[PDB]
Design a protein around this nucleic acid. Structure first.
Lengths: 247, 121, 362, 145, 147
RNA sequence: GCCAGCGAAGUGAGUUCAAUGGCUGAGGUGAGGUACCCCGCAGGGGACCUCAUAACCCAAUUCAGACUACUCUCCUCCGCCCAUU
């Protein structure tokens, strides 16, 4: 029953980051998750100290609700088109062990097949910009919903154009018609310093997609916590949690 | 003289829905008007969802200038379409406006008293 | 399928009743006393400018209440707190600004039942026996644990009391911001400022808002007709929607312009020169609402100009249990409210407004 | 042979319940010294996946557990050292003489090390636990508690 | 593993057979998308970008068979009367009219087209009373009886 | 081990560029509340209102049996833990 969990694609500078954190803490949010877009052309890996939130923010974000300390997550969104770049991401399962939730973005149907079949990821990114048609096979979706794969739908087409709005709503209606709507969570991107709307109306932005009259909000509020759970069971251990506790 | 007892139970007699929204304009160029807000509400649903769905029976209550707050009503048909139209951020001139909804009710009393904070200290 | 989801429904329940004050079967006093948590108590009188002092002294003395920051739950199960506040009066307690579908919410009943609605994590970490209450289809969202303190006060050495004490003290210390009140029904006086002196207790008075509205177009009613006769009387539900429109500080005529506002007043009606409006906002005790309802009943003893007065009470929109057994959920909104339309021949109307997912009592 | 070995039993009775639990105290010291001689590294910090490998590959027979979250609330708040282990349950002994049977169905156990605390989700840990140290531990399923 | 498709027949009723000769798949698709974009927004027109497509077209006959989804055929068939003002090389005014709505099932849709064509042949005969068309009618009846 | 086909009408649904569990209301069942009615063993029976009636999945010739995927639902054998006499 953990609400207020979305995925943000936002890094420009510290000032815009502080503004987005203050805006999210003001409106309705209690967990901020920052994505980092990495494409297949650059192939860069800077994982050790790239962001450093706690050394630069001031000790607490204050919200209007229960006034609880906001947990801040650092996630990685990897755009993967080539199959060799997917093999590079296969090589990163033992070399560098950070970035609690690993989010792959597929473009090839064979690569999307082996992503749901063999490749150990947390949440598959599905965004459609500038004419990307894609078919859906149902038994890997069944293995995905049996495993725990929550499908990410990162949306921000309303700010730039309207054709991008059309392709996103068409791909989302196709996803809701084929995937049947078991675990699909939607999230907003942040390039401009104000690209966030109300938290209760994200439920209707998912209800325009479909998925239920109420289990859209119930499914995002359950499956984002289940996504943090899946990332934690990938990070710590698959059945064990070992934490150093020195009182 | 008349004194008696009678139990009457209704099913969905509400037929209306009200929205209290506080406006958060980004730029300092606040050239608001009562007619221009209505024109923006018409032009948003037209390009976003439809001109047929833009002329839904809607009106504005307690339109406040400095406080930047208003109440919009639509009947029980296009409330979802109104929420999504105000979600997808239809603009007017090129200064992009953030439209953030405070509260929605089917009642003008539970909305008018308080629902959001319920104590502000 | 999706087009029907665009326009299906939010759920609505609106129940209207008519009754007598001099009737022995009238359970309005039980319905006010056994309703516990209240936020906004407003009353409306047509054709009355100056308020009497007897009602003004009742309005200015509806509180007070108390606010304690970070109070642990194991203070609420001590025998001193039971023998001091619970056994000697009506003690009311509720957590502050914790959502019922999102966060943990604890409430205390005057019968002695501490009822706490928890999520799955807190229900597993405390280890108390409860029941599955709020679902998500096949998954379970929120549990409710009820602990009857009056039965445990008779046997303080039982295993149940030490189990709950070990669960609250050492197993999972839960702290919340508590709103507190205590209706005194005891000869031994002991204030709450001296008991909770270790934590930052704050005494607060309810806010009083007074309004005198001009040229208000009030509908004409019949006492012995709920549905309303054609062309003589109006409907009580349209009068309730107009009541909400008046309490939203909105009262205008037809305005043909670009920003078209079509609003039909309930007709036939009567123009009222002065409308007195009072709103009390805070942690309202139901016994003060009982004295207010008795004073509004006895207001029509003298020949007055008001045909009917209005008493609307909106409760807390973030409480676990309201209307004596019913669960207050939050499906994108929804509240619970009750109204009184008091006539001059001791007849009244009992309205009940229900939000999205909540059961209605008789 | 199996039905011929099931004559008396190999399981506990009423008679070993009253065995004065302080006599079972050197089993905890044995397990603690076995953890001290197994890991043999404490001071700076080192490799929590080495700790997950030691907690997967070793037999947890005769160890201190405590139920920290479970689907039944009455199971939660139970500590003690464990004595038996079966397909989907295992049996522990607690304080003043009484023993409890905790099922590994949907629950998680806090285990106290010499200087560490480990949460173990007892969902996939099942099926004749000599199979755990043998083979076949893959990455399937998450547990929401 | 499949999706229940819906189909619809529409007749273009107009004179001046340059309008009958002015038909193309891309032009009709862009016309229907542009006239839905005026009536419906992104949600209505973009669902026609994935679900709606041209399926069967005849130039001289003027019968157009189109596809549409289960949750969108009401929106498509409500968007069909608002197809107005086709601007082209000449000043034309074409207009669609629905014959019958067939729930998928292309085979009986082709069956109903044959009976509609026979009704369009046989009823036009008595009012004209001309042998030059009647000879082609007799040839068409003979060729249909050879089938 | 081997050895036996019928091109002509149209399946208590028979489609194949691949239709058929759509809406409303009262009763069934699992529950809650009662200021309704009848009968006099504290009570019993009927009456009024609301919530839940899902998931697995989809037929192309049929049937029998076995399999795997189920949980609104019913008949039993049970185990553990909590509380009482």
């Amino acid at each position: 029953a953990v609400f207020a969990d979305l995925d943000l694609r936002a890094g420009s500078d510290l000032k815009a980051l502080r503004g987005l954190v203050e805006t999210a803490a003001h409106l309705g949010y209690s967990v901020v998750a920052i994505n980092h877009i990495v494409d297949f052309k650059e192939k860069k890996q800077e994982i050790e100290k790239p962001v450093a939130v706690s050394e630069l923010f001031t000790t607490l974000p204050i919200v209007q609700g229960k006034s609880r300390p906001i947990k801040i997550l650092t996630r990685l969104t990897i755009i993967v088109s080539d199959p060799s770049h997917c093999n590079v991401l296969r090589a990163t399962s033992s070399r560098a062990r950070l970035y609690d939730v690993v989010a792959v973005f597929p473009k090839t149907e064979k690569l999307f097949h082996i992503a749901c079949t063999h490749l150990d990821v947390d949440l598959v990114c599905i965004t459609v910009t500038e004419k990307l048609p894609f078919y859906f096979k149902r038994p890997p979706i069944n293995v995905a919903i049996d495993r725990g794969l929550a499908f990410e739908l990162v949306y921000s087409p309303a700010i730039k154009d309207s054709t991008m709005r059309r392709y996103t709503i068409s791909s989302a209606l196709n996803l809701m018609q084929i995937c049947k709507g078991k675990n699909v969570i939607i999230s907003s991107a942040a390039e401009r310093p104000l690209e966030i709307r109300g938290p209760y109306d994200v439920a209707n932005l998912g209800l325009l997609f479909g998925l239920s009259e109420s289990d859209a909000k119930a499914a995002v509020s359950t499956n984002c916590r289940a996504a943090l759970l899946h990332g934690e069971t990938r990070k710590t251990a698959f059945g064990i949690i070992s934490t150093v506790k020195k009182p | 003289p008349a004194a008696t007892y009678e139990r009457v139970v209704y099913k969905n007699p509400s037929e209306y829905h009200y929205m209290k929204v506080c406006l958060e304009f980004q730029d300092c160029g606040v050239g608001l008007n009562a007619a221009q807000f209505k024109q923006l509400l018409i032009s948003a649903v037209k390009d976003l969802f439809g001109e047929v769905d833009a002329a839904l029976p809607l009106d504005i209550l307690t339109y406040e200038e400095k406080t930047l707050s208003a109440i919009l009503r639509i009947c029980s048909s296009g409330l979802v379409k109104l929420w999504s139209s105000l979600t997808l951020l239809g603009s007017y001139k090129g200064k992009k406006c953030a439209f953030r909804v405070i509260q929605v009710s089917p009642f003008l009393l539970a909305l008018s008293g308080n629902s959001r904070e319920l104590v502000l200290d | 399928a999706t087009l029907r989801r665009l326009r299906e429904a939010p759920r609505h329940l609106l129940v209207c009743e008519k009754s007598n004050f001099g009737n022995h079967k009238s359970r309005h006093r039980h319905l006010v006393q056994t309703h516990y948590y209240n936020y906004r108590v407003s009353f409306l009188i047509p054709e009355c400018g100056i308020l009497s002092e007897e009602l003004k002294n009742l309005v200015m003395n509806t509180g007070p209440y108390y606010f304690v920051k970070n109070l642990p739950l194991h203070e609420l199960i001590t025998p001193e707190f039971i023998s001091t506040f619970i056994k000697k009066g009506s003690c009311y307690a509720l957590t502050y600004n914790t959502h019922i579908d999102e966060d943990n919410t604890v409430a205390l009943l005057p019968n002695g039942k501490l009822i706490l609605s928890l999520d799955k994590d807190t229900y597993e970490e405390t280890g108390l026996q409860g029941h599955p209450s709020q679902f998500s289809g096949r998954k379970i969202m929120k549990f409710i644990v009820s602990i009857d303190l009056m039965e445990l006060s008779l046997n303080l050495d039982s295993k149940k009391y030490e189990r709950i004490s070990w669960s609250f003290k050492e197993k999972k210390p839960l702290k919340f911001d508590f709103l507190l009140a205590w209706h005194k029904t005891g000869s031994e006086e002991s204030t709450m400022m001296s008991y909770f002196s270790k934590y930052q207790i704050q005494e607060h008075q309810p806010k009083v808002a007074l309004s005198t509205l001009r040229d208000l177009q009030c509908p004409v009613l019949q006492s012995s007709e709920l549905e309303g006769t054609p062309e003589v009387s109006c409907r009580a539900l349209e009068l309730f929607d107009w009541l909400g429109a008046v309490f939203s500080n909105v009262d205008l005529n037809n305005e043909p312009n670009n920003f078209i506002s079509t609003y039909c007043c309930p007709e036939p009606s009567t123009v009222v020169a002065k409308a007195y409006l009072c709103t009390i906002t805070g942690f309202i005790l139901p016994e003060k609402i009982c004295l207010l309802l008795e004073h509004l009943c006895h207001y029509f003893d003298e020949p007055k100009l008001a045909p009917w007065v209005t008493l609307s009470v909106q409760g807390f929109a973030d409480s676990p249990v309201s209307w004596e057994k019913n669960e207050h959920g939050f499906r994108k909104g929804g509240e619970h409210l009750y109204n009184f339309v008091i006539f001059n021949n001791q007849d009244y109307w009992l309205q009940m407004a229900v939000g999205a997912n909540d059961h209605c009592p008789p | 042979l199996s039905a011929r070995q099931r004559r008396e039993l190999r399981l506990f009775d009423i008679k070993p319940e009253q065995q004065r639990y302080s006599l079972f105290l050197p089993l905890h010291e044995l397990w603690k010294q076995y953890i001290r001689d197994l890991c043999s590294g404490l001071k700076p910090d080192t490799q929590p996946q080495m700790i997950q490998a030691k907690l997967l590959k070793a037999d947890l027979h005769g160890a201190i557990i405590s139920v920290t979250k479970s689907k039944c609330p009455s199971y939660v708040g139970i500590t003690g050292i464990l004595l038996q282990e079966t397909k989907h349950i295992f049996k522990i002994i607690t304080k003043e003489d009484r023993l409890k049977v905790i099922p590994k169905l949907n629950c998680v156990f806090t285990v106290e090390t010499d200087g560490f605390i480990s949460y173990i989700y007892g969902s996939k840990f099942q099926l004749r636990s000599s199979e755990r140290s043998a083979k076949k531990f893959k990455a399937k399923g998450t547990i929401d508690l | 593993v499949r999706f229940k498709h819906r189909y619809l027949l529409c007749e273009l009723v107009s004179d001046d057979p340059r309008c009958r000769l002015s038909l193309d798949d891309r032009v009709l698709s862009s016309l229907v998308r542009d006239t839905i974009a005026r009536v419906h927004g992104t949600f209505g027109a973009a669902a026609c970008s994935i679900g709606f497509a041209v399926r069967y077209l005849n130039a001289y006959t003027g019968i157009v068979l189109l596809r549409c989804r289960k949750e969108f055929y009401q929106l498509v068939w409500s968007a069909l009367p608002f197809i107005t003002y086709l601007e082209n090389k000449g000043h034309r005014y074409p207009c669609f009219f629905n014959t019958l709505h067939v729930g998928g099932t292309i085979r009986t849709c082709q069956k109903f087209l044959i009976q509609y064509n026979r009704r369009q042949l046989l009823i036009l005969l008595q009012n004209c009373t001309d042998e030059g068309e009647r000879e082609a009618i007799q040839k068409s009846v003979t060729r249909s009886c050879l089938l």
